[PDB]
Design a protein around this nucleic acid. Structure first.
Lengths: 92, 98, 89, 164, 205, 116, 161, 166
RNA sequence: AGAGCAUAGCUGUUGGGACCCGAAAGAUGGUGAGAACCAUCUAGUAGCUGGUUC
RNA sequence: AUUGGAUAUGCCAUAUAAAGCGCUUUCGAAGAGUCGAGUUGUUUGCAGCUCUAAAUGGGUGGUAUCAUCUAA
RNA sequence: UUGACCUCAAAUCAGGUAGGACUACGCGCUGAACAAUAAGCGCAGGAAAAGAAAAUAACCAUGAUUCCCUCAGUAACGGAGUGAAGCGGGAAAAGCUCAAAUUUGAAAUCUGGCAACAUUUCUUUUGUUGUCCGAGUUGUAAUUUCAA
């Protein structure tokens, strides 16, 4: 049950001259702390495990593949005579 | 022969089928990393002035005051109930430490 | 469906006190059956309902007078009116 | 105004001595320049063209998404954050994330020095994940110095509202 | 504390997403004639009716009014008593708000009316329940804030062909009742035993 | 404002020429794609069988056509529709299989590098 | 009537006449050569497709067709196999014969190993046997590219052919 | 990634960090011109998710519009008029105060060769995208004119269609 | 123990400028210097006036 | 004389590459002054103003729990 | 003192782009009298807009958009009047791109200058290759878009 009470803070309020029968100010609130100290409620403890459970790909244990793509492209240009070799650059 | 008979009737014999779940319906599922990121951001960023009011109300009992304030600012009661549970957990985690 | 026993228990549980004054309850249950067969006919239905309302109003006014409670609204008193004056005008 | 603790922590940076030692180890692990990478690749290209096994490269780690990923995976041993990132929100969470993962971290002065290490104009953050076996002691000494000069020091002003 | 100057009755007014011009006007008009009715925002979930009790408990209203709208055309009215209590569903038809011109009544706002109930309400136990519930809710209890001790209106509930007709009248000195303006038909749908929950105990059929 | 229909014969001819212009571009293959057979979504028409938009991914998988090659051979794909009953699955798998039985797919040239 | 159209009428300059008005004209066929050779430039596209033994639509037709002369169980659908369909006309037979003869000609789908691929797989075979590929892939020194068992199996198969 | 942190931090629109930064930056932005070029987006997560790429041909412009039509739509048209050689791509809210609402617009140069050679932004070069913000073809413009899918969102009715055989 | 549906013509009737013509509205946008003048909405109108063809 | 798409046939082809379909003792990120709530107008939409979110969440429907969809 | 970075600048520096006109048909912001109309203002193209569901439905379910027929002068609103939509039948059919997860065993990305080589509706147009500088780690490529 709720007893159909009435809180003291409801938006509705009680109370020619209206005297025939019966039944603003700048008030502050309280001394409040506007700049509370930083509260570390989550990072006060260290998470010991990595955040990601995804498996480790094999690309991180093997020689780089996009470097290999460039190497094959550079080797092709050397074969086609488009890029001067290091020896050719040195002798020139 | 290829061709559609576009008239009526194909057979009233019916048998249901079991369908899986589409990946779109998985929306709203909480990720482990996302929940971690939100907890980090919630701590790094402070609290709104209205959130500080609700937190200080919750600490000094006054649960009806906090619920009424949260509903007034957020809107619906569902949003207000979620904020109280979130801010209550923030208080308890803080009170366990400081 | 239409559980008489359940309704009777609910009525008893949420029954208002019988000793409560009619002025406090502001409810009237005068014995005047307002039966209007011509439901579509507005004039016939209104007259049947007004007859019960007139009897109920008179009984409540007499009860209010016997209860030392002001029933008639004073003309000098100026309170907010629920009815829209602009709509009537 | 009053500076929030998350932003006020960027006013206290690593001191002169420890920062100098930090960049001394970092300068041994600078990434390969665009020119140096080109020479190494054409050298392998000449070997491939004529007739034809290496080791994993060691260098500092840069890039914000990359470094934050390394911290979350606990792969980073030391994270150095630029103290003057123009939109501060890019790094305002970084000290706390480094605290959650238990990664040693420091806030070094300006981003030009960090960018110079990586041959860029600007680096908001640098991370060290792997060092050679001969640099294990040097990295361990810096981690202790960073802890003693940045973490053991302060640790109370970073919770206080600075400015005003 | 638990409650300061606790008035005997209080009414909570709500609505669902999709109310129309007439439905909104009727809700505003009903609030106007209800001095101690706490109007509230829209209810987000059109299905979760368990939240009404928590809303009533929070606002200390023992009576709940819900204006549920479906298909943007039909309007339903749910009335219940916060603590457990019977939840009775109504259908609202023949809408005539204050925007019309036929009405010519004049009743003071907050004035305590006189509730007249037809004898047909005593024919069946379910009609007895709805009459008692309407009397407890519609009737303004003494001591209510903004209420007026004077009487300038009378509410009449005429049961016609199984449907309740609500008519608000004006008392004129000489009774010569004059319609206040709220006119609609209360068509009972079903009555429950709990606050927007529990098994249904009465089906109008 | 009156909408006249004096161009009704002209539009009939213009659409016919579009069909012939399309057939000139794609000589041996049909001017329309094969549509599935579906049931209209109401109690008034659910006994009728009409043409759908495209074949569901479960229909294509059963018939042996992957969703990446289905469009290349003129089989539309409807990612939205699903088979709630085994009858719709069987009605449209057979439609695909009959379509593939009558299909001549001309080969395409492929680049084969000389080395490995 | 418009001032622009009056302007060019008053001019002594000729109009930019173009003659592109010829209806009843049907688009000529490009693309398939066999279709173009057998196409009838007068008949409609439905009449030509039917004569050539092709299907102009795999679906229903949305009107009445022309009549020129007075004519005189899921298991057994997902698992049944239909053995193609007969070629009604000669044109379809040319299309079918051309398709199979081109597919046979362009049928070399076996890739021979290159110089690097040959050496890579040879070093792995001459050390870890021939039938054990899982151990071949788990080697880190010889298998530097970290190919899995399937790729090493394919390198073996391509080496054989 | 660090954009998950920035996207989550941007939701706490008036936390201690966000309120302080919004107050500080509003003071600075009011010192500069009404429409002024931004060296880099203040919200690199939000600009990134709205199509912006940190490459040549992509331009960020900040603008303030008085509060008290849509404000975002007004920001887009004024910035698009300011640099009329560029195409307005998208826009986003960055800040607001009691007097002004601040927005940043992402503009794309349709003559730069880094834009004309990118197939992912090649579409904006076509002349049908000249002044999209003036025809309501941006995200806020589409929302402002009720363009959408569903029941939530005349000439053909006012006509009298008269067929040949009727 | 169904009598309808479609088309055409005729007649009546209701709308469209609606048999023709006859009083100034008003509004929008301009020109010239309060007032004046111009162009469109606009076939906004005459309970009536006059006329309405072998 | 210009050019379309193809066909056929040479010459090159940087394939240590890149794809579709099997399988899973491994993972699966999803758009915020936005949704929404209140109040004023225009016409449910749109906009201003005050406030301001969520993660199996959110939108929209049938229930009066289920269905459907996955916005900024 | 010098250098790196940032910021503010300047330049008859080099290379580009905007304006104005026409608007029958687009799309916007507006807006009277009597119509969401005229007029006013802004912005396009050969079409525009819309568009691959935060869509319907309650079925044996449908499946981006647009248009036509029908639904239907119906439901609904409000008696008059205003007046749709789902389904159904046709025309045409085509699907996709990102943001958000580390390439991290290698910024794999791009503009510009210069120098050659081609190429042209074209000595007028387009590129390619090489080199240097710049952009870019406050994120350019590949990969992924929930249908996964």
């Amino acid at each position: 049950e709720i007893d159909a009470g009435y809180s003291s803070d409801s938006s509705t309020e009680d109370v020619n001259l209206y005297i025939n029968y019966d039944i603003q100010s700048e008030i502050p609130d309280e001394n409040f702390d506007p700049y509370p100290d930083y509260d570390d409620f989550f990072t006060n403890t260290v998470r010991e495990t990595p955040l990601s459970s995804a498996p480790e790909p094999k690309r991180r244990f093997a020689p780089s593949k996009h470097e290999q793509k460039r190497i094959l492209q550079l080797a092709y240009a050397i074969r086609k005579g488009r890029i001067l070799t290091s020896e050719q650059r040195a002798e020139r | 022969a290829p061709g559609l008979v576009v008239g009526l009737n194909k057979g009233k014999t019916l048998t249901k089928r079991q369908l899986p779940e589409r990946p779109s319906r998985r929306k709203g599922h909480l990720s482990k990393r996302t929940a971690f990121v939100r907890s980090i951001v919630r701590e790094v960023a402070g609290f709104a002035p209205y959130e500080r009011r609700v937190m200080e109300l919750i600490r000094n009992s006054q649960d009806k005051r906090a619920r009424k304030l949260a509903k007034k600012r957020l809107g619906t009661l569902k949003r207000a109930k979620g904020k109280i549970e979130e801010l209550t957990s923030v208080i308890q985690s803080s009170r366990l430490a400081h | 469906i239409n559980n008489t026993v359940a309704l009777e228990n609910i009525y008893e549980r949420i029954k208002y006190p019988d000793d409560i004054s009619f002025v406090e309850n502001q409810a009237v249950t005068t014995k005047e059956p307002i039966i209007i067969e011509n439901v579509e006919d507005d004039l016939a239905r209104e007259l049947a309902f007004y007859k019960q309302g007139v009897s109920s109003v008179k009984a409540a006014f007499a009860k209010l007078r016997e209860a030392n409670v002001l029933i008639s609204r004073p003309h000098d008193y100026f309170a907010e009116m629920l009815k829209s004056d602009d709509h009537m005008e | 105004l009053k500076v929030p603790p998350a932003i006020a922590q960027f006013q206290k940076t690593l001191d002169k001595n420890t920062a100098t030692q930090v960049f001394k180890l970092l300068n041994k692990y600078r990434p390969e320049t665009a020119a140096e990478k080109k020479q190494r690749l054409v050298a392998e290209a000449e070997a491939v063209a004529n007739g034809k096994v290496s080791k994993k490269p060691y260098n500092v780690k840069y890039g914000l998404n990359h470094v934050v990923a390394l911290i979350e995976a606990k792969k980073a041993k030391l994270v150095l954050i630029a103290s003057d990132v123009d939109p501060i929100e890019l790094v305002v969470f970084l000290p706390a994330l480094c605290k959650k993962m238990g990664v040693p971290y420091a806030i070094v002065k300006n981003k030009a020095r960090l960018g110079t290490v990586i041959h860029q104009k600007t680096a908001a953050v640098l991370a060290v994940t792997e060092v050679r076996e001969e640099d294990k002691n040097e990295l361990a000494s810096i981690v202790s110095a960073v802890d003693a000069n940045f973490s053991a020091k302060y640790d109370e002003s970073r919770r206080k509202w600075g400015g005003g | 504390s638990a409650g300061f100057v606790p008035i005997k009755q209080k009414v909570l007014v709500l609505s669902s997403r999709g109310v129309t011009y007439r439905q909104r006007h009727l809700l505003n008009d009903l609030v106007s004639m209800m001095p101690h009715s706490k109007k509230d925002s829209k209810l987000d979930s059109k299905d979760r009716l368990y939240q009404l009790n928590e809303l009533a408990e929070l606002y200390n209203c023992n009576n709940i009014f819900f204006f549920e709208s479906r298909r943007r055309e039909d309007l339903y009215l749910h009335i219940a008593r916060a603590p457990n209590g019977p939840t009775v569903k109504f259908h609202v038809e023949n809408l005539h708000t204050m925007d019309e011109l036929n009405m010519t009544g004049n009743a003071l706002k907050g004035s305590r009316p006189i509730l007249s109930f037809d004898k047909t309400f005593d024919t069946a136990p379910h009609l007895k329940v709805v009459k008692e519930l309407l009397q407890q809710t519609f009737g303004i209890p003494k001591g209510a804030r903004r209420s007026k001790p004077f009487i300038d209106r009378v509410c009449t509930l005429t049961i016609a062909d199984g449907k309740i007709w609500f008519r608000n009248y004006e008392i004129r000195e000489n009774v010569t009742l004059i319609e206040i303006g709220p006119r609609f038909v209360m068509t009972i749908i079903n009555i429950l035993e709990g606050s927007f929950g529990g098994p249904v105990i009465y089906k109008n059929d | 404002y009156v909408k006249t229909w004096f161009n009704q014969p002209g539009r009939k001819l213009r659409r016919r020429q579009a069909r012939q212009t399309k057939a000139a571009k794609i000589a041996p293959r049909p001017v329309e794609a094969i549509r599935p057979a579906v049931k209209p979504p109401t109690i008034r028409y659910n006994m009728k069988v009409r043409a759908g938009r495209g074949f569901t991914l479960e229909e294509l998988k059963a018939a042996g056509v992957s969703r990446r090659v289905a469009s290349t051979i003129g089989i539309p794909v409807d990612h939205r529709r699903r088979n709630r009953s085994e009858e719709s699955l069987q009605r449209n798998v057979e439609r695909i299989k009959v379509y593939l039985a009558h299909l001549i797919v001309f080969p395409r040239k492929a680049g084969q590098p000389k080395k490995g | 009537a418009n001032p622009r159209q009056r302007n060019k009428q008053r001019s002594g300059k000729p109009r930019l006449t173009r003659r592109n008005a010829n209806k009843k004209a049907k688009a000529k066929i490009y693309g398939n050569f066999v279709i173009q050779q057998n196409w009838d430039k007068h008949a409609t596209l439905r009449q030509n497709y039917a004569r050539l033994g092709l299907l102009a639509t795999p679906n229903y037709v949305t009107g009445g067709v022309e009549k020129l002369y007075p004519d005189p169980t899921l298991d057994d659908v997902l698992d049944k196999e239909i053995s193609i369909a007969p070629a009604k006309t000669e044109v379809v037979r040319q299309l079918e014969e051309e398709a199979v003869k081109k597919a046979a000609r362009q049928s070399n789908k076996m890739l021979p190993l290159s110089a690097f691929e040959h050496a890579y797989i040879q070093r792995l075979i001459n050390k870890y046997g021939t039938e054990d590929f899982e151990s071949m892939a788990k080697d880190v020194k010889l298998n530097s590219k970290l190919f899995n068992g399937s790729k090493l199996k394919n390198l073996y198969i391509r080496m054989k052919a | 990634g660090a954009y998950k942190y920035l996207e989550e931090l941007a939701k706490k629109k008036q936390s201690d960090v966000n309120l302080f930064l919004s107050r500080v930056r509003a003071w600075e932005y009011r010192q500069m011109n009404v429409i002024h070029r931004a060296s880099r987006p203040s919200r690199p997560d939000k600009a990134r998710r709205l199509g912006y790429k940190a490459k040549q041909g992509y331009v960020i412009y900040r603008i303030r519009v008085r509060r008290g039509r849509s404000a975002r739509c007004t920001a887009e048209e004024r910035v698009g008029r300011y640099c009329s050689n560029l195409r307005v791509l998208n826009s986003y809210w960055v800040n607001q105060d009691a007097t002004y609402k601040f927005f940043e617009v992402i503009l794309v140069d349709p003559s730069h060769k880094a834009i004309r050679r990118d197939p992912r932004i090649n579409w904006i070069v076509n002349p049908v995208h000249k002044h999209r913000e003036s025809r309501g073809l941006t995200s806020i413009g589409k929302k402002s004119r009720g363009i959408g899918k569903g029941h939530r969102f005349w000439l053909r009715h006012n006509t009298l269609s008269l067929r040949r055989y009727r």
